[PDB]
Write a protein that binds this ligand. Structure first.
Ligand SMILES: *[C@@H]1O[C@H](CO[C@@H]2O[C@@H](C)[C@@H](O)[C@@H](O)[C@@H]2O)[C@@H](O[C@@H]2O[C@H](CO)[C@@H](O[C@@H]3O[C@H](CO[C@H]4O[C@H](CO)[C@@H](O)[C@H](O)[C@@H]4O[C@@H]4O[C@H](CO)[C@@H](O)[C@H](O)[C@H]4NC(C)=O)[C@@H](O)[C@H](O[C@H]4O[C@H](CO)[C@@H](O)[C@H](O)[C@@H]4O[C@@H]4O[C@H](CO)[C@@H](O)[C@H](O)[C@H]4NC(C)=O)[C@@H]3O)[C@H](O)[C@H]2NC(C)=O)[C@H](O)[C@H]1NC(C)=O
Lengths: 717, 207, 207
């Protein structure tokens, strides 16, 4: 019966064995000399990819009796691969064809879930189920995509997950899903994320490795990284598994990936290439995500074609070509075993030990939240909660290279805090990891870790020097009772009166004076370099000038301001010189090097639109004031040209009331011009670069129209 | 890499409310170097108002980079040479393709509506015909409409080359016999560059 | 080298007196090695009764080796797969092309003759129409004849796909108004596999 087997551990290697290449699949076909029992111990998962093989083939007897126990003995699980449409569909849906037996109801899908599992998993005493969510296997009705069928499969997938998998009664059997779709595109990932053990993305060829191309962007899309990136939200990284493909015999265009090494045109006789060097599979074996954690492993397709060389690219055009590779060979599964050992050689799959985290409560908290690998520390970019109070030493937090957030909650026993016992990304930095995939022809920026320190009663020292911290948010100073030393020098902190940082600093400083006084040795907070941002809104919304023969720079006059991350508006250089002289303990915090010019944000590249009283637009900062006029000056960011950041009201001389276009919204009621394009001369906008506002065909065209409102017309344009 | 420049729809070029497009498809694009830079000219006047269409969901095999260009009606009808210069890194030098309107003396389409056959009156449905002959060039569009409301169930034959040199075509409007016998109006709406406002109608009803 | 297998003329396959041909053109043939060996199969049954056509005038540049095969009518109408296996020395392995009759339930062509339009009666010439609809497959042939004598000046539109799934087409016979008003007979002679003797006529005259 169900043989006991050790759980899934380390890097895995999958392999879809094609049934019709088995020797017992069809005795008439004598060329098939392979067997599914010959799969070695290196192969963790052995998927049963069934087609062509007959319904009542001799393979099914050989599978359940001879193969499954042999594989389970050595340590290899057997999994059945059903398509998407077996869960819900009509066209070739196997079990779901009989809709009268298994209806589309709450109870009906629960009966179908059992029927699927029993027929596929438990029938031959297999060790898991696999669902292939592809466009090739998508639920169709009369060779047309079915909307209700896809919505049914989702619900069925949940019910099957209640039977087998992690959240099932029978957890011995695996529940797997394989997908060419991406996370955002595939709809089952959201619903059946907890219900699966492994996800098997199929990314054959350079289209998978390098990613497709976006012509409008002229940049790569759906890359290997971007593929995972979406799935990272839904599943853990150790569940993820990538797929390559071996050469299928007499393969045609649209199914030639050239993953494993091709045949040499010289070597006409030889059609075997067990060498794995310079292959896509070998690179896939070595590939690890840049964030989140290490992958679960890789898998092959048509593992029965292990070691078989790929048909050259030259002969890819000619359909009827009998190459040496198109012959069938008795594979000894050298590549599978080689690629497995390559993944074992990977050092990231080394477990976390006392070397990394001496403290047990920390080491257990990390294992629960983050992961159980050394590589996970280099990658993981999520929250890490250290709420457990019984924690002595935070040694080896520097192992975390890309941690997103760190919560220190109720950790009284902690005393000192410095770069040693904190993440590496306390300060900013670029990506240190290196990819092992091919590409076309810049390392990613690592966000500084968010630090919430609250409830640490027995915390004494606190060093955050040279970390370039933007704020002091998170530091609950009221709970830090036993505080004595502090160091926040060489950061980008706005420590001005009234700021949240100063409130935290003052609450901290009052604790320092009590215990060991306040001085240069205990307290440090010098040489700050606060980040200068753009303000949300602006105050200077008007400007009355004379009718002088002079020119004025509207930008400098109207558009100015450099807010901080806390919220201190520095408008002029004088305001900064005042800011520089925020003396705390008889010395300023701001660096002397960090002048106003280094802090100031540039308002170059900002566009401007000067609408005069007769709605006459002009895009020039240098406004002449020689003529009497009233203006509405709108400013726009280099990013967003449509939405104005600020609007002003310049009035050279006596104010004139701003006119309004009475034609805008005019009811066209005649003229030779086309009524459609006639309305678009009163639309309000000019039009898109590639619009069409041709009034008519003839050179002369007329428009008869009525105004929207009554008024006194003083001007037209 | 192969280039395939295509002309605008006749209906689009003969109606100013609609927007005509000169599509430039590129098939068998290099998988290694998939960068494609399109350059668009109109009698030498290079325009930069094109729009590369998003990569459609072809399964595998060959990249197919489309590039559309919105064009002025007058420019097409005047017969300006729209040139699509494709530029690929794999390609040693750019592939150019040029297209223009059919060059020849335009001719007015004589539009004629024919009623259902005397034999077809026995059937529960009937076929209203619209002959359109003696026109040039082949760029033409035809539409039916019953009592103002645009018709659904009709089909138009391709422009066929006539003996004299002009083209011709028919358009079959399949309707129920009820609406014919009751006495509705059905109007064949031909559209050709050699018409008043590129438009003309011929009504058809029972007698 | 590119191969282009072509079906027989509809008129040839629907008349036993005429002889149908399955042409297999080969273009862009190697200038270096111009030897082309055609192999002809009919559901595997290799036939050896083909005839390589002489090199037509041609305007240099690229060799175009045509190969004709005379076929039995019944074999075509039954829908046997005619396969043209081209073999060139430059070509690494032979290019095969296969063709057969359209697979689906045949349907009878409803033939209807329509007289000239009421408006066209003002013109010195008139257009006699012949609607042919509701037929499948597209393999069809149409001819006019006035008082027995085969007509010269007429044109037939390609088979156009109808809404239901069948095809249809029109045929325009341009004649003088004199012969129409005088009261001659003109007969639209449709020919389709789903007819009696693959043949049917509909006469047309003044009333
Ligand atoms: C585009 O590429 C993708 C793959 O790439 C992926 O997507 C792209 C976009 C990128 O993102 C990549 O990075 C990414 O990796 C293609 O998807 C693959 O397509 C190939 C075929 O081109 C498939 O291989 C074939 O698989 C069929 C199996 O078909 C079953 O399984 C399908 C998947 O579940 C399912 O959709 C089918 O409906 C079918 O399902 C079965 O249905 C029956 C009946 O209901 C049921 O009983 C079964 O239980 C059920 N089984 C399953 C598992 O669902 C297989 O049959 C094919 O074998 C033929 O072709 C081989 C060569 O490719 C050849 O070696 C074999 O010998 C065999 O050839 C036939 O042999 C018989 C004799 O036995 C002979 O009589 C025939 O004449 C002969 N036929 C031919 C044509 O030679 C083959 O193995 C992949 O499985 C599939 N990928 C995956 C992961 O499944 C996509 O199709 C490509 N599209 C285009 C347009 O190019």
């Amino acid at each position: 019966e169900k043989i006991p087997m050790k759980p899934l551990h380390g890097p895995l290697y999958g392999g879809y064995f094609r049934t019709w290449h088995d020797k017992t699949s069809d005795p008439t076909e004598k060329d098939k000399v392979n067997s599914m029992g010959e799969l070695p111990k290196e192969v963790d998962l052995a998927f049963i990819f069934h087609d062509w093989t007959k319904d009542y083939s001799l393979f099914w007897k050989e599978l359940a009796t001879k193969h499954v126990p042999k594989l389970n003995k050595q340590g290899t699980r057997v999994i059945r691969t059903i398509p998407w449409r077996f869960l819900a569909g009509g066209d070739n849906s196997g079990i779901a064809e009989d809709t009268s037996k298994y209806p589309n109801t709450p109870e009906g899908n629960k009966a179908l879930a059992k029927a699927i599992v029993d027929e596929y998993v438990y029938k031959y005493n297999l060790d898991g189920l696999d669902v292939a969510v592809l466009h090739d296997s998508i639920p169709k009705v009369d060779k047309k995509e079915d909307t209700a069928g896809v919505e049914r499969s989702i619900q069925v997938f949940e019910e099957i997950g209640k039977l087998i998998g992690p959240k099932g009664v029978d957890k011995s059997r695996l529940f797997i899903m394989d997908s060419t779709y991406m996370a955002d595109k595939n709809p089952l990932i959201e619903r059946g994320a907890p219900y699966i053990n492994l996800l098997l993305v199929q990314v054959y060829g350079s289209q998978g490795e390098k990613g497709g191309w976006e012509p409008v962007s002229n940049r790569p899309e759906k890359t290997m990284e971007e593929r995972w990136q979406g799935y990272s939200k839904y599943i853990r990284p150790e569940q993820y598994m990538i797929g390559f493909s071996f050469y299928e015999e007499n393969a045609q265009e649209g199914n030639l990936w050239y993953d494993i090494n091709s045949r040499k045109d010289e070597d006409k006789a030889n059609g075997i290439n067990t060498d794995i060097t310079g292959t896509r599979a070998e690179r896939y074996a070595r590939w690890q995500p840049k964030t989140g954690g290490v992958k679960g492993g890789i898998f092959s397709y048509a593992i029965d074609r292990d070691g078989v060389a790929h048909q050259p690219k030259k002969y890819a055009k000619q359909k009827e070509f009998k190459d040496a590779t198109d012959n069938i060979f008795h594979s000894d599964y050298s590549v599978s075993k080689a690629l497995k050992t390559v993944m074992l050689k990977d050092k990231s799959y080394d477990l976390i030990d006392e070397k990394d985290f001496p403290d047990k409560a920390l080491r257990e908290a990390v294992m629960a939240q983050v992961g159980t690998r050394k590589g996970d520390l280099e990658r993981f970019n999520g929250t890490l909660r250290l709420d457990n109070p019984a924690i002595q030493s935070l040694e080896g937090l520097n192992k975390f290279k890309k941690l997103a957030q760190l919560d220190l909650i109720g950790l009284s026993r902690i005393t000192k805090l410095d770069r040693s016992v904190l993440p590496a990304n306390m300060k900013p930095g670029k990506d240190t990891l290196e990819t092992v995939l091919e590409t076309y022809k810049e390392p990613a920026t690592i966000p500084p870790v968010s630090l919430k320190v609250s409830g640490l009663t027995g915390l004494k020292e606190l060093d955050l020097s040279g970390f370039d911290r933007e704020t002091l948010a998170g530091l609950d100073a009221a709970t830090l009772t036993s505080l004595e030393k502090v160091d926040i020098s060489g950061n980008k902190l706005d420590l001005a009166p009234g700021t949240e940082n100063r409130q935290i600093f003052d609450t901290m400083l009052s604790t320092i004076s009590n215990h060991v006084g306040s001085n240069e040795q205990t307290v440090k907070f010098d040489k700050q370099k606060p980040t200068g941002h753009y303000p949300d809104t602006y105050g200077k919304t008007s400007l009355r000038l004379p009718v002088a023969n002079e020119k004025v720079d509207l930008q400098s006059q109207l558009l100015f301001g450099t807010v901080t991350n806390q919220g201190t508006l520095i408008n002029s250089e004088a305001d900064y010189k005042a800011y520089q002289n925020h003396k705390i303990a008889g010395r300023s915090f701001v660096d002397s090097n960090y002048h106003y010019n280094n802090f100031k944000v540039s308002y170059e590249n900002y566009t401007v639109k000067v609408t005069d009283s007769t709605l006459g637009t002009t895009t020039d900062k240098t406004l002449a004031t020689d003529k009497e006029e009233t203006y509405k000056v709108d400013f726009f960011s280099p990013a967003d040209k449509t939405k104005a950041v600020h609007t002003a009201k310049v009035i050279v001389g006596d104010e004139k009331t701003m006119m309004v276009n009475l034609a805008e919204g005019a009811t066209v009621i005649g003229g030779s011009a086309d009524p459609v394009n006639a309305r678009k001369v009163f639309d309000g906008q000019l039009g898109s670069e590639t619009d069409n506002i041709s009034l008519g065909w003839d050179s002369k065209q007329s428009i008869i129209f009525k105004l929207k409102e009554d008024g006194l017309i003083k001007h037209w344009r | 890499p192969s280039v395939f420049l295509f002309p605008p729809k006749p209906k689009d070029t003969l109606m100013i409310s609609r927007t005509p497009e000169v599509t430039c498809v590129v098939v068998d694009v290099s998988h290694e170097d998939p960068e494609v830079k399109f350059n668009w000219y109109v009698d030498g006047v290079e325009v930069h108002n094109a729009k590369t269409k998003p990569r459609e969901e072809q399964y595998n095999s060959t990249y197919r980079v489309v590039s559309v260009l919105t064009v002025l009606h007058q420019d097409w009808l005047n017969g300006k040479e729209y040139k699509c210069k494709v530029s690929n890194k794999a390609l040693p030098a750019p592939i150019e393709k040029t297209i223009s309107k059919a060059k020849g003396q335009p001719r007015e389409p004589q539009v004629y509506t024919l009623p259902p056959s005397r034999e077809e009156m026995t059937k529960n449905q009937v076929s209203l015909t619209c002959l359109v002959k003696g026109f040039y060039p082949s760029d033409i569009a035809v539409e039916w409409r019953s009592n103002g409301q645009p018709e659904n169930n009709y089909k138009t034959t391709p422009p066929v080359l006539d003996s004299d040199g002009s083209f011709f075509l028919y358009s079959k409007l399949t309707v129920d016999k009820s609406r014919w016998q009751q006495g509705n109006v059905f109007s064949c709406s031909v559209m050709h560059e050699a018409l008043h406002n590129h438009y003309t109608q011929k009504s058809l009803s029972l007698s």
